[PDB]
PDB file of C-alpha atoms in Angstrom:
ATOM      1  CA  UNK A   5      -3.157  -6.825 -10.508  1.00  0.00           C
ATOM      2  CA  UNK A   6      -4.569  -4.477 -13.120  1.00  0.00           C
ATOM      3  CA  UNK A   7      -2.764  -3.850 -16.443  1.00  0.00           C
ATOM      4  CA  UNK A   8      -4.197  -0.393 -16.784  1.00  0.00           C
ATOM      5  CA  UNK A   9      -2.801   2.872 -15.485  1.00  0.00           C
ATOM      6  CA  UNK A  10      -6.279   4.290 -14.972  1.00  0.00           C
ATOM      7  CA  UNK A  11      -7.370   1.958 -12.216  1.00  0.00           C
ATOM      8  CA  UNK A  12      -3.966   1.943 -10.559  1.00  0.00           C
ATOM      9  CA  UNK A  13      -3.717   5.734 -10.264  1.00  0.00           C
ATOM     10  CA  UNK A  14      -7.357   6.149  -9.449  1.00  0.00           C
ATOM     11  CA  UNK A  15      -7.327   3.533  -6.655  1.00  0.00           C
ATOM     12  CA  UNK A  16      -4.079   5.137  -5.473  1.00  0.00           C
ATOM     13  CA  UNK A  17      -5.550   8.614  -5.460  1.00  0.00           C
ATOM     14  CA  UNK A  18      -8.807   7.669  -3.893  1.00  0.00           C
ATOM     15  CA  UNK A  19      -6.749   5.908  -1.230  1.00  0.00           C
ATOM     16  CA  UNK A  20      -4.737   9.176  -0.844  1.00  0.00           C
ATOM     17  CA  UNK A  21      -7.979  11.151  -0.620  1.00  0.00           C
ATOM     18  CA  UNK A  22      -9.358   8.748   1.949  1.00  0.00           C
ATOM     19  CA  UNK A  23      -6.380   9.181   4.253  1.00  0.00           C
ATOM     20  CA  UNK A  24      -6.487  12.930   3.559  1.00  0.00           C
ATOM     21  CA  UNK A  25     -10.221  13.435   4.186  1.00  0.00           C
ATOM     22  CA  UNK A  26     -11.364  10.610   6.393  1.00  0.00           C
ATOM     23  CA  UNK A  27      -8.047   9.787   7.936  1.00  0.00           C
ATOM     24  CA  UNK A  28      -8.509   6.129   7.142  1.00  0.00           C
ATOM     25  CA  UNK A  29      -7.980   4.060   4.103  1.00  0.00           C
ATOM     26  CA  UNK A  30      -9.403   1.088   2.381  1.00  0.00           C
ATOM     27  CA  UNK A  31      -7.841   0.561  -0.923  1.00  0.00           C
ATOM     28  CA  UNK A  32     -10.482  -2.095  -1.704  1.00  0.00           C
ATOM     29  CA  UNK A  33     -13.309   0.367  -0.998  1.00  0.00           C
ATOM     30  CA  UNK A  34     -11.314   2.818  -3.082  1.00  0.00           C
ATOM     31  CA  UNK A  35     -11.242   0.267  -5.922  1.00  0.00           C
ATOM     32  CA  UNK A  36     -14.990  -0.144  -5.537  1.00  0.00           C
ATOM     33  CA  UNK A  37     -15.715   3.562  -6.059  1.00  0.00           C
ATOM     34  CA  UNK A  38     -13.101   3.617  -8.840  1.00  0.00           C
ATOM     35  CA  UNK A  39     -14.918   0.785 -10.612  1.00  0.00           C
ATOM     36  CA  UNK A  40     -18.095   2.874 -10.176  1.00  0.00           C
ATOM     37  CA  UNK A  41     -16.446   6.080 -11.480  1.00  0.00           C
ATOM     38  CA  UNK A  42     -15.023   4.058 -14.338  1.00  0.00           C
ATOM     39  CA  UNK A  43     -18.592   3.561 -15.430  1.00  0.00           C
ATOM     40  CA  UNK A  44     -19.822   6.964 -14.367  1.00  0.00           C
ATOM     41  CA  UNK A  45     -19.135   9.799 -16.720  1.00  0.00           C
ATOM     42  CA  UNK A  46     -21.169  12.108 -14.528  1.00  0.00           C
ATOM     43  CA  UNK A  47     -19.909  13.515 -11.167  1.00  0.00           C
ATOM     44  CA  UNK A  48     -23.541  13.818 -10.114  1.00  0.00           C
ATOM     45  CA  UNK A  49     -24.082  10.150 -10.695  1.00  0.00           C
ATOM     46  CA  UNK A  50     -20.842   9.350  -8.926  1.00  0.00           C
ATOM     47  CA  UNK A  51     -22.180  11.180  -5.883  1.00  0.00           C
ATOM     48  CA  UNK A  52     -25.499   9.305  -6.125  1.00  0.00           C
ATOM     49  CA  UNK A  53     -23.668   5.974  -6.534  1.00  0.00           C
ATOM     50  CA  UNK A  54     -21.612   6.652  -3.445  1.00  0.00           C
ATOM     51  CA  UNK A  55     -24.666   7.744  -1.483  1.00  0.00           C
ATOM     52  CA  UNK A  56     -26.719   4.830  -2.631  1.00  0.00           C
ATOM     53  CA  UNK A  57     -24.218   2.005  -2.217  1.00  0.00           C
ATOM     54  CA  UNK A  58     -21.686   3.339   0.214  1.00  0.00           C
ATOM     55  CA  UNK A  59     -24.020   5.682   2.099  1.00  0.00           C
ATOM     56  CA  UNK A  60     -22.657   4.013   5.231  1.00  0.00           C
ATOM     57  CA  UNK A  61     -19.756   6.455   4.856  1.00  0.00           C
ATOM     58  CA  UNK A  62     -20.091  10.208   4.898  1.00  0.00           C
ATOM     59  CA  UNK A  63     -18.595  11.559   1.730  1.00  0.00           C
ATOM     60  CA  UNK A  64     -18.017  15.294   1.556  1.00  0.00           C
ATOM     61  CA  UNK A  65     -18.652  16.850  -1.867  1.00  0.00           C
ATOM     62  CA  UNK A  66     -14.997  17.855  -1.885  1.00  0.00           C
ATOM     63  CA  UNK A  67     -13.968  14.202  -1.586  1.00  0.00           C
ATOM     64  CA  UNK A  68     -16.463  13.106  -4.273  1.00  0.00           C
ATOM     65  CA  UNK A  69     -15.211  15.846  -6.582  1.00  0.00           C
ATOM     66  CA  UNK A  70     -11.618  14.935  -5.963  1.00  0.00           C
ATOM     67  CA  UNK A  71     -12.342  11.283  -6.496  1.00  0.00           C
ATOM     68  CA  UNK A  72     -14.131  12.294  -9.695  1.00  0.00           C
ATOM     69  CA  UNK A  73     -11.158  14.463 -10.559  1.00  0.00           C
ATOM     70  CA  UNK A  74      -8.570  11.735  -9.935  1.00  0.00           C
ATOM     71  CA  UNK A  75     -10.582   9.127 -11.823  1.00  0.00           C
ATOM     72  CA  UNK A  76     -11.151  11.685 -14.552  1.00  0.00           C
ATOM     73  CA  UNK A  77      -7.426  12.476 -14.696  1.00  0.00           C
ATOM     74  CA  UNK A  78      -6.504   8.873 -14.962  1.00  0.00           C
ATOM     75  CA  UNK A  79      -9.195   8.072 -17.529  1.00  0.00           C
ATOM     76  CA  UNK A  80      -8.013  10.915 -19.749  1.00  0.00           C
ATOM     77  CA  UNK A  81      -4.361  10.135 -19.045  1.00  0.00           C
ATOM     78  CA  UNK A  82      -3.570  13.279 -17.166  1.00  0.00           C
ATOM     79  CA  UNK A  83      -0.477  12.371 -15.260  1.00  0.00           C
TER      80      UNK A  83
END
């Protein structure tokens, strides 16, 4: 339950990207990296954040950039 379109679409899209790239999904994990990218205004830092905290997963740059993109879209209101 989040009363913001940003988080909803971003979690949604990260979840989409997860099934697309990894072939698995974890909408909670998605929310985690969304919460991180909500704070992060830098793709570079998003990558670092993912590597540092969620380095247990292997994130391709493509995925990170798409996650950044989706979060970015939602945080600018690009729907």
